Design a protein around this ligand. Structure first.
Ligand SMILES: NC(=O)c1ccc[n+]([C@H]2O[C@@H](COP(=O)(O)OP(=O)(O)OC[C@@H]3O[C@H](n4ccc(N)nc4=O)[C@H](O)[C@@H]3O)[C@@H](O)[C@H]2O)c1
Lengths: 329, 329
């Protein structure tokens, strides 16, 4: 039977699904193996299930000459050398984009946790000093306040659909406008970016991959927005300028920053740090963060895993995998 | 089985990749088909891969009623009526990032080729009279001189990073500034366009197509440039006034002009010429030209065609294409 190496943890029903026809080497832990260990297990693997920390280049593929398919549990492939996979006879497949809705829900969670001081409220309960209502942790409400979504892709649309019930004044800017039926269903008004920043209490950058500009919010955009406003970032790491956020945090220009993504995360940008700034990390008062949980819901992660596994089973049986992005040999 | 028309030549792997789920009609030649023949092949097609010479308007779409998706192998879609496509129920997809780096590389090659008289040097050697060094073709060197970037977007940033090792004095002019640690990393300096035009030995416009700042480098703009400057145009062919340039070269204020783009190819404006002004075509000593080769790297064109193909495969299967700027129903 063929051998499939899985670089990260999958749910056990996926293991049993692959084990009908392949010999499965699981990563039993929640950790990322080092490159030296991955190549060691896949030295003689017929298939490899790859995830976001994986990095497939010609050096990797030369050390794995038995490989016939790489099944990516990812919706894109920026970290693979696709043409090298082809040159070496390796199918390279992806899965559809299933992240849109769980990321809009977590963006909103981020919004509420930050503006309602829910972390420091949890900390005070986890002490012992709680003895009832107190005039503290007076936060900031959504109702009647104005919120702006910089981008209006599928995920920005997913937020607006969900914020619709919150009696807010939702502004959006985007080069292409929503259908007028969507604008009336979600009471969301289209404006410029000068307007959006000037007038918003909450700014959420949320642009589809197609409309890409790095550092979309910098100190230049921070100065333009309302004083004491809040910024929430779960789009991508490059979209926010972290050092300029820290500046507005200090000058009272920002009362809060929340983020599920960071610029350090990425390695295709040359100006990459590789730790999260200590300035945002010590400020537990004005910040709320989570470790790229944007898609960390079980139903979604399971469906992403099944589809890469199906991709893998299909290629091994000598079929064209439904998810191919290349045609090898 | 749905059908997909490709208006220009693609790599055979792309054809094989589209074939899994559609019947493919390729342009088997390296030439642009005329509008009529393109419409003839698409009339009953479910998908179209458009390149830069293609021009989709309402009339095109009405000829092609079965159309579900246009996969443009482009970043700039100045030639696609996004609204009409939406009205007709047609996904419009673009390809966001792959052209930035190949274009910076060519701009820098244009700079070296022009300042070093490298074209003339090749002529002088193919003529067979080379019998050693002579005191001729003395050019302008890069180290110690000032270069200015009008437009510090994606491409302008890729140029400055590549040029920071050439011991130059880099200036830039742009509405959005660079942040503090990027200005330090490349020792770029923000200035006004008038400063730029005044203290620059080389000027590189890198700005998108605009209403005005169309013809941004014009007789008035030249008029404040240093005597003996050089101008390298690799953005859109209409950002420079090509006839103001012809005058600048004969009068001695421009020591040369290199372009990869020409006013002639812009059909978006009625003020469209139909040839490159032959005054420039004959000045072989002061010019350097390439036929829109900014992204003519073979490996990049593959990934650009791959991205456009994937959008089509996604749309035809029912997903949302990863590069969609559109949303029909
Ligand atoms: N030869 C080729 O084959 C080829 C290949 C790729 C691209 N292209 C061309 O198509 C464009 C996209 O280039 P870009 O660099 O990708 O675009 P972008 O980031 O949007 O633009 C920079 C912006 O300049 C701005 N700006 C804007 C208006 C204004 N009044 N003042 C400003 O200052 C603004 O602030 C921003 O920084 C050209 O640049 C050029 O390269 C040619």
């Amino acid at each position: 039977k063929p051998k499939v190496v899985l670089t990260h943890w999958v749910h056990p029903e996926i293991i049993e699904l692959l084990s009908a026809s392949a010999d499965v080497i699981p990563n039993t832990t929640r950790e990322t193996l080092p490159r030296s260990e991955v190549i060691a297990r896949a030295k003689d693997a017929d298939a490899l299930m790859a995830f976001m920390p994986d990095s497939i280049d010609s050096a990797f593929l030369e050390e794995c000459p038995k490989l016939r398919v790489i099944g990516a549990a990812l919706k894109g492939y920026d970290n693979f050398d696709v043409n090298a996979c082809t040159r070496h006879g390796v199918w390279l497949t992806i899965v559809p984009d299933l992240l849109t809705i769980p990321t809009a829900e977590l963006t909103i969670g981020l919004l509420l946790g930050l503006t309602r001081h829910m972390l420091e409220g949890d900390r005070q309960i986890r002490s012992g000093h709680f003895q009832g209502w107190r005039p503290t942790l007076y936060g900031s409400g959504l109702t009647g306040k104005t919120l702006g979504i910089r981008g209006m892709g599928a995920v920005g649309r997913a937020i607006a659909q969900r914020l619709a019930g919150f009696e807010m004044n939702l502004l959006y800017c985007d080069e292409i406008p929503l259908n007028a039926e969507q604008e009336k269903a979600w009471h969301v008004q289209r404006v410029t970016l000068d307007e959006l920043l000037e007038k918003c209490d909450y700014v959420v950058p949320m642009v589809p991959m197609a409309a890409e500009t790095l550092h979309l919010i910098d100190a230049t955009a921070l100065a333009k927005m309302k004083t004491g406003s809040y910024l929430i970032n779960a789009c991508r790491g490059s979209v926010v300028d972290e050092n300029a956020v820290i500046a507005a945090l200090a000058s009272g220009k920002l009362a809060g920053y929340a983020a599920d993504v960071f610029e350090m995360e990425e390695w295709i940008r040359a100006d990459r740090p590789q730790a999260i700034p200590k300035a945002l990390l010590d400020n537990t008062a004005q910040t709320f963060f989570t470790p790229h949980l944007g898609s960390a819901v079980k139903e979604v992660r399971l469906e992403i895993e099944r589809q890469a596994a199906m991709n893998i089973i299909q290629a091994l049986a000598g079929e064209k995998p439904m998810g191919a992005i290349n045609q090898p040999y």
